[PDB]
Symmetry: C3
Subunit: 147 residues, 3 copies
């Protein structure tokens, strides 16, 4: 009957859809429905298994695994980014400590420069006063000589 | 008939596959096809729902949600990495500003050191010439005493 | 017969499930099973295709593509994080080089300051001994005048 054929094709089609959802292994029964509604009972080979989009795992297993991958890949990258930010936080503190130390060096350099200028000025006055005193003495001697 | 059985199994198999694709809820009709081709009409419990890979959501819903997760997880991490790179860019500018300021401190220190050394050489000369003059005066006095 | 109906619904149901797994295009035969078990043979429009969860791609194609997306998104972010860490490593070395240079500036400044201080103490001794010698000469002259 025609109803025998429709029922046979439907069962084999339902079977094959089930294997796409729940997977298949090497040796497991697989049906090939020919364009003329012909059912061919075949036992899947290592070829059919290895050369399948999901390699006989089925949509459920693949989606369960992909969900695991997505979740692990987020945990993995979040830890890497938290590690990078930790490194950035330490560099920031060390750069602020360097700038604070540089500001103090600059303060100490200004004090040494000003003490230098003040010393230079004080030596000049003493040199001028000393010159004036030695010149005066020389004059008192040059005058006391000629008599 | 045997065709009655094949058609019944095919419908129930097609039905279940549909529920794996489109999902099921607590109370919704579920068929269990026994290894002897026996169909058992039941009503999915809260147990069947809670203890299912996708918890009665179906492959379509789960894949639509997983696509949302993948896309949001990329937007979330791209913003975190753009934030980290923004910090790195600010640290680079500040570190280049510190190095430029350190180079100027070094230049300022060199000039203070040169000014100090020049002053040191100038005072030594002055000190020497002063010693010479005072020594000469003392001699003119030590000689003028001897009479 | 009732078995004719069950077989025709099963085939159409198995057919649609297959299209949900393997996809459908505009023009491709689609069956709509009415709640009264009525099969309606139609042709999928551009509307049915554009307004479908996966736009007629099917669960297999969508899951294969999503797997590609997940994998590329990890390669893309791992390279961005390796790039950020590369910058962090170069900032660390440059900050350690700045701190080493700042420590040497401090050492050089400490030495200029101590040389300034020693010089300052040496001129004070010289100035004091010079004042004394001049005061003595002035006394020998102030006394030798009084006769
Ligand atoms: Cl099916």
């Amino acid at each position: 009957d025609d109803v025998k054929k429709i029922a046979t094709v439907a069962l084999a089609a339902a079977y094959n859809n089930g294997q796409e959802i729940n997977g298949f292994k090497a040796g497991e029964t697989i049906y090939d429905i020919d364009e003329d509604g012909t059912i061919t009972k075949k036992d899947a080979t290592a070829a059919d298994v290895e050369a399948d989009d999901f390699k006989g795992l089925g949509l459920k297993k693949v989606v369960t695994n992909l969900t695991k991958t997505v979740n692990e890949n987020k945990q993995n990258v979040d830890a890497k980014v938290k590690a990078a930010e930790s490194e950035i936080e330490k560099l920031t503190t060390k750069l602020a400590d360097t700038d604070a130390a540089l500001a103090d060096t600059d303060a100490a350099l200004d004090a040494t420069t000003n003490a230098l200028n003040k010393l230079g000025e004080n030596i000049t006055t003493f040199a001028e006063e000393t010159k004036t005193n030695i010149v005066k003495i020389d004059e008192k001697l040059e005058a006391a000589s000629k008599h």
